Design a protein around this nucleic acid. Structure first.
Lengths: 151, 129
DNA sequence: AAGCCCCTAGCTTTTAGCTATGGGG
DNA sequence: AAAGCCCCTAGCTTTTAGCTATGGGG
């Protein structure tokens, strides 16, 4: 797990984000799909967001991004959707004349870390009960590094 | 994991949050410790934040919370540190006289999900079938 | 636990098109 | 060290306070 920092915070914030075209229209294909990913890389680059992985399918775009918590994941999403919509609708006439908007008003966001919820949960509850490891070998590297980083 | 939603977003945003008192002073004990926890529960409830787990040691408080992304993790944190700082220093004299502030300007924040990073990264690249 | 319809100001993408623990249908 | 120590502005809460801001400096 790689941790970064801004002028006040030490963090590791990863998000799996997903959003669909309006009406789930299967328009994320070919040149549309390609341009869409290039625009989002552009957006991420200027918003200092790190795209760990990004793939699409006819009607969904999946993005795994590491975002400065203070900046805000929504500020990123808002920019990526908004800009891709404006641009793609200008480049691909069918997206302008056959749809009222390229995207919807919603999205799906799930946070992601180096270990599963239950592990972090236990580590937190273990704090005052001395050295009581998670298990034999399961996630030793994560817990060890964590004790060290959160010292 | 059970997702929640606001008017426009479906989400599950959990963070492992940690912060320490000024100078690492080991003051999070006894009466203080218990009150800090109450105040954080009071702020969580008020800000519609779910506290999944909260533990403390002499100089650290760990919180695993579910926070609406539209609302903002930082907004929860500043409220929690700020109010707890105000209230604790009003109730506990030794916190107001021995320290210029109760907390510091920093904190540790780590996202957590039902699945580890590598799994989610795989699932994503597998989205062409 | 969104996704459809409608609405607002705010802010970017500005003759646009998206968010807001947004309003309601 | 910088996250943590110092100092500062500016915005909002806790506001005869005390924490933020992809804040800036040291």
């Amino acid at each position: 797990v790689l941790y970064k920092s801004n002028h006040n915070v030490v963090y590791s914030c990863k998000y799996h984000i997903v959003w669909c075209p309006k009406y789930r229209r299967k328009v994320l294909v070919g040149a549309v799909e390609m341009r869409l990913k290039e625009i989002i890389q552009e957006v991420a680059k200027e918003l200092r967001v790190e795209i760990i992985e990004m793939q699409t399918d006819k009607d969904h775009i999946h993005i795994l991004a590491d975002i400065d918590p203070s900046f805000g994941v929504m500020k990123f999403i808002k920019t990526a959707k908004g800009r891709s919509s404006r641009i793609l609708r200008q480049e691909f006439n069918h997206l302008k004349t056959k749809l009222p908007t390229l995207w919807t008003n919603s999205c799906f966001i799930s946070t992601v870390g180096g270990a599963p919820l239950n592990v972090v949960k236990q580590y937190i509850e273990n704090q005052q009960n001395s050295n009581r490891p998670k298990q034999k070998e399961k996630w030793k590297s994560y817990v060890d590094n964590l004790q060290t980083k959160a010292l």
